[PDB]
Structure formats: structure tokens, C-alpha cells
Amino acid sequence: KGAIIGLMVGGVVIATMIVITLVMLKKK
Amino acid sequence: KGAIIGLMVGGVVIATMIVITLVMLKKK
Secondary structure, eight states, X not given: OHHHHHHHHHHHXXXXXXXXXXXXXXXX | OHHHXXXXXXXXXXXXXXXXXXXXXXXO
């Protein structure tokens, strides 16, 4: 059941990538 | 097995909170 954790540890990384935009947008 | 996903969707949120610091640090 490594597929479950694999995605788990992956989501976080993606989630951290989306916010990186929210930041740059602070100067919209 | 709701505990697994519960943490999954939670990690992302936490992960997104840690980076929020990395940003503010850009002006270290």
C-alpha cells in the first residue's frame, strides 16, 4: 500500500507549490 | 480508514503553512 503514502507525501509538495503563487499575487 | 485521508488532506494544509514562513524569510 505504498501508493497511498506516495501520494500523501506528494500532495504536500504540490500544495506548497500552489501557495507560492498566492504569495506573488500579494502584489496583484 | 478515514483516519488515513483525514491526515492526508491535513498534511497539505500544514505543509502550506510552513512555506508561508520561507516567504517572509525572503527578506531575511
